[PDB]
Design a protein around this ligand. Structure first.
Ligand SMILES: O=Cc1ccccc1
Ligand SMILES: O=Cc1ccccc1
Ligand SMILES: [Cl-]
Ligand SMILES: [Cl-]
Lengths: 259, 259
């Protein structure tokens, strides 16, 4: 049989490691290892997002996961939505630990503009926040912008193709979060020698109603990838609406980086 | 159309509102209203269990839920496992807001012994805790016995008939909890005028490896219920392994307490 891989899965803002509950057993049934990280102030972490003030603090559990890998192990690192930013931060630290970066319906930052660039572009473009609640919290180093999705927003823009149970589950577990836009604006550019040296691919859902198909080409035009995979019928929450097709895409990717 | 009901669902220790993610849409599709309470330090509740030092504090979000209901509304109150204790505490405060208590694979306390009596009785003969981690936390209320389920124990004794996806979900969401057995053993006995006045039924799973049949019969013999319903093939986590059959049970209870 084929050599199997270790997939490290990184969830999106306002969510947690739970989002991967359908995909993880699919990958593990095929022989692969899976670590679903839980970011700071996310999921069941009993720390509020207000206490996490920086994207580096947010991302620490991911950093710790990579640091703990044995010597010479490499992983397929999958970042979902805001998780794109977390995986890029990690790739700037431990590029040699990452076989390939999988940007799943994700923000794909570049190594030219300030790290908030793609997030600022999406906020300018996006008009469907609906009943999302936006708020601020003042820290000793400035304003931190926060968000809590509304349930109408969730249903229309993230989960519209998911089973109703998955939506009910998300209603019971989503949390106030942040895209750390101010912090990321002040941070040093991602580097060519770290993040830009790592192999990367894009996996997009054909019915993503938060990260539109054109915005994805714009990002990939600003910063190219080796390959784009498309999941037919996926909503944004594609590991919930089309977990078997996502498994297919990640199995194709693993075959492409035969490790 | 038969008139519908408002179900209030109360989860077990070390879990949270999320466990009802399958049952809740089934009930709502049939026309009912459902409120899935998140107890203190449970699920995404921002407190650790160390900050929740008494069972009254633990139960506060259920008490608040009942307190907030409009005048003369009555609910079907469903307590799962340690949630039998919470719903009894609630019934002793707002008996007139409860149409019927539903003890689902639950501790059924009485009005003769201390409120810890049925827990103490199970704990003495419980069988293996496996890889469950026990710890203590000293407080101004005395010493709290904490536990955190281990994953082998969950698989073997709670989730054995559940889809692998639900088991993985639970691994990503379960938390350190407590059964508050010290606090319960010093609380005043549940009252005959409050708790004892409220209609009750018991719903049991046939394959619950935590709360076995003979123990349930002993509890009911100490404290009678109006009717018993059995879910054939259910594990302890019956909302996850047989949610349709749990729906059918609750639906039958709702027809029995019509009007
Ligand atoms: O995809 C993640 C996300 C989170 C909060 C709001 C919008 C999108
Ligand atoms: O039913 C809930 C429960 C939780 C921890 C251990 C045993 C049972
Ligand atoms: Cl996100
Ligand atoms: Cl319990």
């Amino acid at each position: 049989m084929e050599r199997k891989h270790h997939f490290v899965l990184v969830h999106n803002a306002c969510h947690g490691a739970w989002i991967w509950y359908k995909l993880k057993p699919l990958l593990e049934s095929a022989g692969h290892r899976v670590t679903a990280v839980e970011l700071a102030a996310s999921g069941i972490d009993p720390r509020p997002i207000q206490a996490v003030e920086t994207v580096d603090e947010y991302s620490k559990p991911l950093i710790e996961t990579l640091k703990s890998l044995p010597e010479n192990e490499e992983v397929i690192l999958v970042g979902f939505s805001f998780g794109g930013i977390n995986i890029a931060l990690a790739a700037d630290i431990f590029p040699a630990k990452i076989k390939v970066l999988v940007f799943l319906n994700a923000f794909l930052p570049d190594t030219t503009h300030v790290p908030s660039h793609v997030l600022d572009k999406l906020m300018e473009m996006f008009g469907g926040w609906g009943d999302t609640e936006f708020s601020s919290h003042e820290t000793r180093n400035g304003t931190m912008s926060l968000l809590k999705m509304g349930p109408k927003f969730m249903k229309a823009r993230l989960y519209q193709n998911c089973p109703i149970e998955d939506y009910e589950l998300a209603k019971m577990l989503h949390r106030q979060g942040s895209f750390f836009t101010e912090d990321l604006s002040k941070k040093e550019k991602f580097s060519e020698e770290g993040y830009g040296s790592v192999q990367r691919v894009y996996v997009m859902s054909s019915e993503d109603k938060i990260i539109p198909c054109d915005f994805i080409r714009w990002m990939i035009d600003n910063f190219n990838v080796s390959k784009v995979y498309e999941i037919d019928g996926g909503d944004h929450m594609v590991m919930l609406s089309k977990p078997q097709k996502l498994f297919d895409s990640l199995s194709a990717i693993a075959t492409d980086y035969m490790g």
